[PDB]
Design an enzyme around this catalytic site. Structure first.
Site, mmCIF file in Angstrom:
data_model
loop_
_atom_site.group_PDB
_atom_site.id
_atom_site.type_symbol
_atom_site.label_atom_id
_atom_site.label_comp_id
_atom_site.label_asym_id
_atom_site.label_seq_id
_atom_site.Cartn_x
_atom_site.Cartn_y
_atom_site.Cartn_z
ATOM 1 N N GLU A 11 0.682 -1.108 0.121
ATOM 2 C CA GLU A 11 0.068 -0.017 0.113
ATOM 3 C C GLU A 11 0.670 1.446 -0.023
ATOM 4 O O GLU A 11 0.308 2.255 -0.407
ATOM 5 C CB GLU A 11 -0.914 0.134 1.144
ATOM 6 C CG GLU A 11 -1.928 -1.140 1.141
ATOM 7 C CD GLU A 11 -2.970 -0.850 0.229
ATOM 8 O OE1 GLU A 11 -3.943 -1.731 -0.111
ATOM 9 O OE2 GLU A 11 -2.866 0.261 -0.694
ATOM 10 N N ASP A 20 -6.501 6.804 -5.100
ATOM 11 C CA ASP A 20 -6.304 5.260 -5.307
ATOM 12 C C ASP A 20 -6.061 5.042 -6.718
ATOM 13 O O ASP A 20 -6.102 5.799 -7.731
ATOM 14 C CB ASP A 20 -7.975 4.696 -5.486
ATOM 15 C CG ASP A 20 -8.122 4.051 -4.490
ATOM 16 O OD1 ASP A 20 -8.633 3.021 -4.167
ATOM 17 O OD2 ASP A 20 -8.127 4.908 -3.221
#
EC number: 3.2.1.17
Length: 164
Positions: A11, A20
């Site tokens: 991440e 994102d």
């Protein structure tokens, strides 16, 4: 290697609101804030989440606190889910981490939709399940990350993350 280190490789860490792979507003260690297009809706969610006026920026500290909550929620979600629980219980420690990773990225619901692969993982048909998991939007949209998770389920060792 552990779940926290694993997810942190996948991440990353960003202390400013960001988008994102999906275009969604996120912060920290993959903490999705809103699926809404307004930076303003995102800022509001952020302050609500932290309990202060953040102005779109958090500390390392705050980032890890959100990360601790998210991981905890993922595991508890797995444990509460009729479809997920049985698979989780059947798995060894390393593979357990791979299912956690999937849930963190895609939510309980999303993973519970991988019916056939789940079935194969429960049966311990590692090679078959890896081939089936790859046949997904997931794999096509985030191939390098999917392939790390997939190798993890395939092998039961942490080698995909050794490199990284």
């Amino acid at each position: 290697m552990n779940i926290f280190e694993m997810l942190r490789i996948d991440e990353g860490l960003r202390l400013k609101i960001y988008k994102d792979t999906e275009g969604y507003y996120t912060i920290g260690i993959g903490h999705l804030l809103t699926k809404s297009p307004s930076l303003n809706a995102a800022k509001s969610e952020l302050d609500k989440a932290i309990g202060r006026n953040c102005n779109g920026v958090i500390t390392k500290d705050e980032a890890e606190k959100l990360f601790n909550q998210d991981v905890d929620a993922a595991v508890r979600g797995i444990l509460r889910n009729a479809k997920l629980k049985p698979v989780y219980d059947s798995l060894d420690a390393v593979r357990r981490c791979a299912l956690i990773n999937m849930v963190f990225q895609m939510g309980e619901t999303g993973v519970a939709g991988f019916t056939n692969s789940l079935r194969m993982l429960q049966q311990k048909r590692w090679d078959e399940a890896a081939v089936n998991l790859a046949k997904s939007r997931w794999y096509n949209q985030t191939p390098n990350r999917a392939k790390r998770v997939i190798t993890t389920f395939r092998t039961g060792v942490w080698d995909a993350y050794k490199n990284l």
